[PDB]
Amino acid sequence: MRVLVTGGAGFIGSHIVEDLLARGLEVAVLDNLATGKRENVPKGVPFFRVDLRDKEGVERAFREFRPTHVSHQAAQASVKVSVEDPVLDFEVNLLGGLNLLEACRQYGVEKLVFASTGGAIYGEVPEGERAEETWPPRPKSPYAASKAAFEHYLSVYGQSYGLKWVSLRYGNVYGPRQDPHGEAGVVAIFAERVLKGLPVTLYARKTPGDEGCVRDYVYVGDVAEAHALALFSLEGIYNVGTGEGHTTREVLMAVAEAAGKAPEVQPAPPRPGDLERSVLSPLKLMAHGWRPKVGFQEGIRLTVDHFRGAV
Numbered sequence: 465m466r467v468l469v470t471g472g473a474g475f476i477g478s479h480i481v482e483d484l485l486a487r488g489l490e491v492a493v494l495d496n497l498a499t500g501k502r503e504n505v506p507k508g509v510p511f512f513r514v515d516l517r518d519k520e521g522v523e524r525a526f527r528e529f530r531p532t533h534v535s536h537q538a539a540q541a542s543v544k545v546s547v548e549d550p551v552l553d554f555e556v557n558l559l560g561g562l563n564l565l566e567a568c569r570q571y572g573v574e575k576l577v578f579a580s581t582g583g584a585i586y587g588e589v590p591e592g593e594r595a596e597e598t599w600p601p602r603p604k605s606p607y608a609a610s611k612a613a614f615e616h617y618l619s620v621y622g623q624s625y626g627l628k629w630v631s632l633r634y635g636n637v638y639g640p641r642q643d644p645h646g647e648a649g650v651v652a653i654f655a656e657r658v659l660k661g662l663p664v665t666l667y668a669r670k671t672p673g674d675e676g677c678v679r680d681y682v683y684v685g686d687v688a689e690a691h692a693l694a695l696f697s698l699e700g701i702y703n704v705g706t707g708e709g710h711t712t713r714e715v716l717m718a719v720a721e722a723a724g725k726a727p728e729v730q731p732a733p734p735r736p737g738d739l740e741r742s743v744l745s746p747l748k749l750m751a752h753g754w755r756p757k758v759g760f761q762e763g764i765r766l767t768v769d770h771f772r773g774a775v
């Protein structure tokens with residue numbers, strides 16, 4: 465099996481590359497380094513410094529590497545950026561995505577595994593409930609629209625052309641090598657600021673001083689494992705979440721514990737157009753044997769250590 469990982473120089477992408485290499489697979493990376501780092505790509509892994517919006521460059525990567533499978537992690541992956549720059553989000557996530565699908569058809573790729581988003585696709589998840597894969601998309605931002613739209617394209621490419629596909633709707637993915645810009649960016653923000661002894665802003669869920677918003681935090685190593693399972697054996701839509709929510713206050717407490725510091729917390733009103741609660745139903749994926757191996761406290765500890773370990 466020869467796997468091309470778009471966005472493989474990025475946070476989730478680099479963990480996927482390492483995971484796949486440890487399963488005897490030939491792996492290549494396609495990445496324009498917009499946010500990814502050349503240093504994240506292991507020695508000996510073919511690296512195509514290519515923008516997915518450059519059809520001729522995508523074609524070159526396919527010709528040179530000859531992938532059998534494609535893992536599509538490359539994206540404009542900041543909700544904020546998408547609201548302030550919907551055209552960039554569209555060009556990268558849809559136009560770039562489509563160039564990739566067209567190369568997949570041309571080269572007879574056997575499966576495309578897509579990084580989708582549970583947080584941005586499902587909308588508000590009521591108390592007591594967990595978003596399930598049959599819930600209808602309720603996109604609120606351009607990022608959500610481009611991800612939802614790309615899933616429609618995967619479905620129509622499967623139906624029309626026979627391209628097999630899986631859409632992994634990730635929860636809030638955190639861990640070593642993450643930046644502060646993705647859906648679980650708060651983990652990096654808190655880790656860096658708590659370590660530096662800077663005040664942290666705790667945005668309210670509804671009232672300044674409350675516990676803050678609820679998300680399904682899933683450790684990046686556990687996401688990489690779900691990705692391998694998906695690649696080998698799955699088709700269709702699967703949530704990749706723990707099925708348990710944590711509040712922003714709980715994240716801060718875990719970061720403080722791991723850093724061994726008592727941070728200065730400053731409450732703020734809710735950030736406008738942020739979800740109060742998102743928790744994903746993990747049942748569909750867990751029926752195929754996947755479970756998080758790394759608990760929340762342990763994962764936060766591992767993330768903090770990574771931020772401590774720079775020079």
Ligand SMILES: NC(=O)c1ccc[n+]([C@@H]2O[C@H](COP(=O)([O-])OP(=O)(O)OC[C@H]3O[C@@H](n4cnc5c(N)ncnc54)[C@H](O)[C@@H]3O)[C@@H](O)[C@H]2O)c1
Pocket residue numbers: 470471472473474475476477494495496497498499500501514515516517536537538539540541556560579580581582633634635636637638646647648649
């Ligand atoms: N909490 C999360 O981090 C989260 C949650 C849900 C879904 N996702 C999705 O997972 C995937 C990976 O996210 P991440 O957190 O690792 O972010 P990331 O920015 O670290 O990784 C994305 C990679 O894509 C590359 N890239 C961006 N635009 C490109 C382009 N036009 N052509 C080629 N490469 C390009 C970047 O350089 C980067 O290395 C994304 O699709 C993202 O939307 C992330």
